């Protein structure tokens, strides 16, 4: 029993904190319900009617947006993401040397976005961007934007760069 809440757009604020059918397009919450209250597992993005998230933070799990339902459709425990009822809508990626934005949506706390620059990450697989802030557990899977707004990478996940592409 893990549900999803939405919590806001996906846009770029320009004046952003600096560091150096049934379910509408949007970030959301993901939520379980526990007897006593109920608890922030992550976060995910709505786009083109389909929900992406990390796979641990729902494990394939089935998802009720408000009436309805939404079940898993594709997954990947190493690359740790699920999609659910699509495929994997967010092809966006980071040039590998502009600024982006994280929209943070941290457990019990209102979305914001916050400018950085992502470290390189250099592994054997390619090199990949890494945004170097620290926020609670359950704020997993919040989207990390480009100039354009569009989603370039999930918190924790890394960011793919495509200049090399």
Not at 65 to 82: A, F, H, M, T
Not at 95 to 104: F, I, N, P, R, T
Not at 130 to 147: E, F, M, N, R
């Amino acid at each position: 029993d893990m549900y999803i809440e939405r919590a806001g757009d996906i846009t770029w604020e320009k004046d952003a904190e600096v560091t150096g059918g049934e379910t509408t397009d949007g970030v959301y919450r993901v939520m379980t319900r526990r007897l006593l209250g109920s608890t922030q597992v992550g976060v995910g993005v709505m786009q083109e009617g389909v929900f992406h998230t990390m796979w641990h933070v729902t494990k394939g799990s089935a998802l009720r947006s408000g009436e309805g339902r939404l079940d898993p459709y594709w997954g990947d425990v190493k690359q740790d993401l699920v999609s659910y009822c699509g495929p994997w809508k967010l092809d966006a990626a980071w040039d590998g040397h502009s600024e982006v934005q994280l929209l943070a949506v941290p457990p019990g706390e209102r979305a914001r976005n916050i400018q950085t620059l992502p470290g390189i990450f250099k592994t054997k697989d390619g090199d990949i961007g890494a945004v170097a802030l620290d926020y609670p557990a359950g704020t997993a899977g919040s989207p990390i934007l480009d100039k354009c707004g569009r989603v370039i990478g999930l918190y924790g996940n890394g960011v793919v760069i495509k200049n090399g592409s």
